[PDB]
């Protein structure tokens, strides 16, 4: 029985529309050489992001609205058009939910629900609190150390974050009575959420097998005459990564402290809680077995590139195992809105960015940068290239397409302005990695951690812009000095 409407934030519709309209009106006075469709899709993308920020019609609704408008203006069809030879020349909005990252994240959310249900997450949280609970900064450093250990085995960051780290964070934040979407989020939750995101960044940066973009950069460099290698990457990133490991947590604890900084009796507290919870149970045993097996498959995926191990089918496998095994009912899975909400909005944003690249925007930016910076010494050229490869990820969501589109061109530019090949390659790779510290759609982990509710998006973007300045500083300066020490240039 319904009487009145639901409260909507019509105020938030002011900024987006305005922006879009403005850019639309600017269409005729566009930079030139740019397709009008591209500029219109760009305006729509910007307005959609502004809506995600201002938060009218939560991310799901505003992204749905953006996709709808994209459909109305004729910028994107619904059914994949064909070239009469079988090729797809324009993908539709429905050919957007067939994305791997989205379904992976969703199934990982489901697995985490199963964890929290069987009681395993609480156990792990009370354990890591027994051992690191004192000085919650210790908790942050434990999770970042865990992520760093895992980066060497699991080559899909989204997995480490949604299947391993995020459950830990949720369990701990539940044990400290820090529930999201409340003022009690700032107790300890947001600290761990943000630290986990940035630790995932560090892990991705330390190991060449931290994600697909790194392999893409490896392939492209080898295409331009320079062979990366697991040991080279590690030996070049070890130092800057440690410097970041030491600085980042400190600046975060100074800028975003958890209101609960000391639990001096956490040891006896956790021991009492573990004694009350009783011994380990059968469903907990089964869920642990499944989690370990899925971890094993995600690892095997790094050495054997096989469809049976795509890092998403593995999640489908683990969840159907939870179903056949009884620990998880299908009704429990059809619940857990987070999965489907992510599916929706992440897939839509990725599709919009794909249309942004297909219509010729990013290619024009590459060509413009190629044609603009001519008479400068290779150092300032490297500086500008890095800054651009950083602040361009605001127009991307994959992390892979960004490199696929802008690595080889930037590398060619640098090598043409005298810059040495190895330095340029590794710097641009580290930059393509640390892009993540911009947005909530940069990569999977950000989409997971910046929307769960522990962190408002405004704080996210601010702190991430700052930490991005810091990441650029560290990597550029120090990693350059270090790659000079060992003979990378």
* Residues that bind ligand HEX in the complex, under the rule CB under 6 A: 16-17, 20-21, 24, 44, 46-51, 53, 65-66, 69, 391, 394, 461, 465
- Nearest approach, Cβ of 303 to ligand OCT (angstroms)? 13
93 binds a second copy (CB under 8 A): yes
Nearer to ligand CCCCCCCCCC, 52 or 449 (CB): 52
Region from 45-53, 89-97, 221-229, 396-404 binding ligand CCCCCCCCCC, contact rule CB under 6 A: 45-53
- Nearest approach, Cβ of 287 to ligand HEX (angstroms)? 22
289 binds ligand OCT (CB under 6 A): no
Nearest to 273 by CA among 113, 130, 118, 117: 130
Which of ligand OCT, ligand HEX, ligand CCCCCCCCCC, none has residue 15 at its interface (CB below 5 to 8 Å by kind)?
ligand CCCCCCCCCC
Which of ligand HEX, a second copy, ligand CCCCCCCCCC, none has residue 138 at its interface (CB below 5 to 8 Å by kind)?
none
- Nearest approach, Cβ of 458 to ligand HEX (angstroms)? 9
Question: Given candidates 15, 235, 269, 340, which one binds a second copy under the rule CB under 8 A?
Answer: 340
74 binds a second copy (CB under 8 A): yes
Question: Residues 1-40: x/- map of binding to a second copy (CB under 8 A)?
Answer: xxxxxxxx--------------------------------
- Nearest approach, Cβ of 31 to ligand CCCCCCCCCC (angstroms)? 13
Nearer to ligand OCT, 61 or 180 (CB): 61
Question: Given candidates 308, 418, 485, 486, which one binds a second copy under the rule CB under 8 A?
Answer: 308
15 binds ligand CCCCCCCCCC (CB under 6 A): yes
- Nearest approach, Cβ of 308 to ligand OCT (angstroms)? 4
Nearer to ligand OCT, 1 or 72 (CB): 72
3-state secondary structure the chain: CCCCCCCCCHHHHHHHHHHHHHHHHHHHHCCCCCCHHHHHHHHHHHHHHHHHHHCCCCHHHHHHHHHHHHHHCCCCCCCCECCCCCCCCECCCCCCCCCHHHHHHHHHHHHHHHHHHHCHHHHHHHHHHHHHCCCCHHHHHHHHHHHHHHHCCCCCHHHHHHHHHHHHHHHHHHHCCCCCCCHHHCCCHHHHHHHHHHHHHHHHHHCHHHCHHHHHHHHHHHHCCCCCCHHHHHHHHHHHHHHHHHHHHHHHHHHCCCCCCCCCCHHHHHHHHHHHHCCCCHHHHHHHHHHHHHHHHHHHCCCCCCHHHCCCHHHHHHHHHHHHHCCCCHHHHHCCHHHHHHHHHHHHHHHHHHHHHHCCHHHHHHHHHHHHCCCCCHHHHHHHHHHHHHHCHHHCCCCHHHHHHHHHHHHHHHHHCCCCHHHHHHHHHHHHHHCCCCCCCCCHHHHHHCCCCCCCHHHHHHHHHHHHHHHHHHHHHHHHHHHHHHCCC
Nearer to a second copy, 301 or 424 (CB): 301
- Nearest approach, Cβ of 357 to ligand CCCCCCCCCC (angstroms)? 17
Nearer to ligand CCCCCCCCCC, 50 or 369 (CB): 50
Question: Residues 179-218: x/- map of binding to ligand OCT (CB under 6 A)?
Answer: ----------------------------------------
């Amino acid at each position: 029985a319904m009487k009145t409407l639901e409260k909507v934030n019509y105020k938030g519709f002011i900024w987006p529309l305005a922006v879009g309209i403005v850019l639309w009106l600017i269409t005729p006075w566009r930079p030139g050489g740019l397709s009008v469709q591209a500029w219109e899709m760009f305006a729509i993308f910007v307005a959609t992001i502004v809506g995600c920020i201002t938060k009218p019609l939560p991310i799901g609704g505003t992204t749905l609205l953006g996709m709808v408008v994209t459909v109305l203006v004729g910028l994107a069809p619904v059914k994949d058009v064909v070239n009469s030879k079988g090729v797809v020349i324009q993908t539709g909005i429905l050919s957007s939910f067939g994305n791997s990252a989205a379904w992976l994240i969703a199934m990982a959310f489901i697995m985490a629900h199963g964890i929290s249900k069987t009681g395993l997450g609480n156990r792990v949280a009370y354990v890591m609190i027994e051992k690191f609970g004192k000085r919650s900064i210790g908790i942050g450093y434990a999770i970042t150390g865990l992520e760093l250990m895992m980066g060497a085995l699991i080559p899909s960051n989204s997995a480490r974050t949604g299947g391993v780290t995020w459950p830990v964070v949720e369990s701990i934040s539940k044990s400290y009575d820090s529930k999201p979407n409340d003022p009690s989020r700032k107790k300890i939750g947001a600290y761990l959420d943000f630290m986990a995101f940035h630790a995932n960044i560090l892990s991705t940066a330390l190991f060449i097998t931290g994600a697909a973009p790194n392999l893409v950069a490896q392939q492209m460099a080898a295409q331009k005459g320079y062979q990366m290698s697991w040991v080279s990457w590690f030996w070049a990133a070890l130092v800057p990564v440690l410097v970041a490991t030491v600085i980042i947590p400190l600046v975060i604890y100074k800028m975003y402290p958890p209101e609960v900084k000391e639990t001096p009796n956490a040891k006896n507290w956790a021991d009492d809680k573990l004694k009350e919870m009783g011994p380990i149970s059968k469903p907990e045993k089964i869920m642990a077995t499944v989690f370990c097996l899925a971890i094993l498959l995600w690892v095997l995926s790094g050495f054997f590139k096989i469809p049976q191990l795509d890092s998403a089918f593995v999640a489908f496998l683990a969840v159907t195992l939870l179903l056949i095994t009884g620990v998880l009912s299908m009704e429990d899975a059809l619940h857990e809105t987070g999965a489907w909400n992510i599916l929706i909005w992440l897939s839509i944003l990725i599709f919009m960015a794909g249309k942004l690249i297909s219509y010729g925007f990013i290619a024009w930016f590459a060509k413009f940068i190629q044609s603009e910076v001519h008479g400068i010494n290779w150092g300032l050229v490297l500086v500008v290239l890095i800054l651009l490869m950083f602040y361009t990820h605001y127009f991307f969501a994959s992390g892979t397409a960004h490199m696929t589109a802008l690595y080889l061109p930037f590398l060619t530019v640098a090598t043409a302005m005298g810059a040495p090949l190895g330095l340029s390659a590794m710097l641009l790779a580290f930059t393509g990695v640390i892009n993540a510290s911009t947005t909530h759609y940069a990569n999977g982990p950000a989409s997971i951690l910046a929307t769960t509710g522990y962190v408002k998006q405004s704080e996210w973007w601010k702190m991430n812009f700052i930490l991005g300045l810091i990441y650029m500083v560290i990597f550029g300066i120090v990693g350059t000095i270090w790659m000079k020490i060992i003979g990378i240039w």
